[model samples]
Target chain A: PCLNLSTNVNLDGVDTSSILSEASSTVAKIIGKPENYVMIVLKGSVPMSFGGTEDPAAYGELVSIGGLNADVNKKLSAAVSAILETKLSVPKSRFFLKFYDTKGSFFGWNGATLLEHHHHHH
Target chain B: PCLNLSTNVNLDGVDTSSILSEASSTVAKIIGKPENYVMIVLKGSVPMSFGGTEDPAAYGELVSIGGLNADVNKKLSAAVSAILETKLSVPKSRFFLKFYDTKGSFFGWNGATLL
Candidate 1:
């Protein structure tokens, strides 16, 4: 139900609202879930370095009850990286996206764990 | 070699230097990794709502190349949560900690993957 992404790019005046909206939509579409079931987090100006320099790079993790597999992860890597590159100028190759195929019992939502009939993933 | 933690608490005016130091030291000591090789990330004000309310809850994942086990994870969870609770006031029950036993080949560092 969430796609939590963080990056070293400073989001100063960047339009994060737009990114959130677009990302939420993209994840819902790709994961075949509803927009209401999606949550997106954008963190910027983090202290991180990649390949050495502290340049524009990103690391992210997406956790959901289902809808994550090899093919879906590849597409997500491409789509999320493309967004970061186009908006935040982070190189696609430098970004790493981690996928967590979680069980509903492990993920919490609405004052209870998603295991309580949370089949939002297709 | 790294302990990355994130929470929904806003750390704008918070002095995270001490938290980083204590946590870096704590992780290094518990995992038996050198302090110099340890990395810690403190992200605050994330858009997350655990248990249906945005009242101050935290979700974190600790990743490292090695030095992770059931006993170590339990200790790390207690240590990391104590730091968060003492410094940030997030409830320990509401805080969920996920542990990752990563491979050196999968985790990256300075110029390339840790492997």
Candidate 2:
């Protein structure tokens, strides 16, 4: 069965546009696929350091990445690192990418129905 | 590091044919590196009885199950079970499949930007 992959990348102190473009390109290159084949969803957040503490970080960042097939882990990790270093100026060590290999059957749309049964012995 | 997989199944009553075929061959059977992937979305509802309600069963049913690497829990089950057992029929061991595994960056697509 083909593997499904997904993960969240924390982009705390990074440039949105540059990182996004870099991330997108990196993903494309890793999979040896075209931009259209890849789907990237980006979400932003507020600094967690809004208070007085010099925590150095604030926003609880999350990046959901996914694609078809099994080799997702290696590709995704490399892509994330490349983007961070070149675009966000963050060293590969500073960033992290977590992956999940998904099952194929579970992917589908809404409105699907489940089946149940009742037997009456005669 | 790898990919993102979603869930949601339940084809109550079946037969929405032409099978969404030819144009898409059961998925092209091409499994990319798990990085380059696919996305699909669908929606529909309402099957719970109204008043009298038969003692046979009420409503409160779910069909979110199976698939992907990790598996889902709360929702998204079965390709199509109750839609029948629930849709109309009333037998078949109430077929069941369950899976849930999700974690990825959330997002906003209500505005313009489309990349």
Candidate 3:
């Protein structure tokens, strides 16, 4: 699964290693997936919004196999929002996250298929 | 409110100006919203995928207040996909688009609520 985070903050000077590592672990732990299968992508200094200003804001999309619902979404949102606040200085209110509960066949990996490795199944 | 487009193509040498203009107009026209209110963002050379490979594919999220339904979505997909094909050389089949028929409050613009 992939947790793609895009923000308006300039992460050039900041240590992206920690953010990526933390997010990878956080998403895996919350979604109950192994860290190896989890991927974190951080895009900074992109044109974006919150309450209609160019202030610090973020948008995220989490695509995972299973482990996503009303209850799990709340927890995931809270956990990731806190990460953004601490590392990127983005307000939780300004940051909005969307979830995509997908299938293994659709979300791929390094040459190998995610059929048996992925958790979600019909 | 916004149509955010991201791809794995390194746009450093690509003519991004035309893509930006065309996308802005396309989204506004199809969604029946003013061009001023519509926003188009392009992120190139990003880590992404489709059909289990990174072979020149794109994932787009179209967020509009209205004009997004079964019928409109099909047309929007066609128009936008054509643009991607012509400009970015991404196959229509390789592109996957998702729509968000959202409300004004949830979307922001111009230092004011979208409402």
**Highest TM-score, which number?**
1
DockQ values, each candidate: 0.11, 0.03, 0.06
Poorest stretch of ten by lDDT in candidate 2 chain A: A56-65
Score residue B35 of candidate 2 by CA lDDT. Answer: 21
For residues A1-122, what per-residue lDDT tens digits would candidate 2 score against the true structure? 11111223244555444544454455566555454323333333323332354232212121222343446556666567665556544455544454433332333222232221342111
**Candidate 2, B3-50: lDDT as tens digits:** 122112234554423222211222222221222232222221311111
Query: Candidate 2: which stretches are off by over 4 Å?
Result: A1-15, A46-72, A109-122, B1-115
Q: What class would a CAPRI assessor give candidate 2's docking?
A: incorrect
Which docking category, incorrect, acceptable, medium or high, applies to candidate 3?
Answer: incorrect
lDDT of each: 0.75, 0.32, 0.74
* Candidate 3 segments whose C-alpha is farther than 4 A from its true place: A1-3, A6-59, A63-67, A70-122
Clashing pairs in model 3, backbone N/Cα/C closer than 3 A: none
Q: What is the C-alpha RMSD of each candidate to the true structure, in Å?
A: 6.2, 19.6, 7.5
Specify the poorest-scoring 10-residue window by lDDT in model 3 chain B. Answer: B46-55
lDDT of 3 at A3: 75
Reference contacts recovered by each candidate, as fractions? 0.05, 0.02, 0.01
- Candidates 1 and 3, the one with greater lDDT: 1
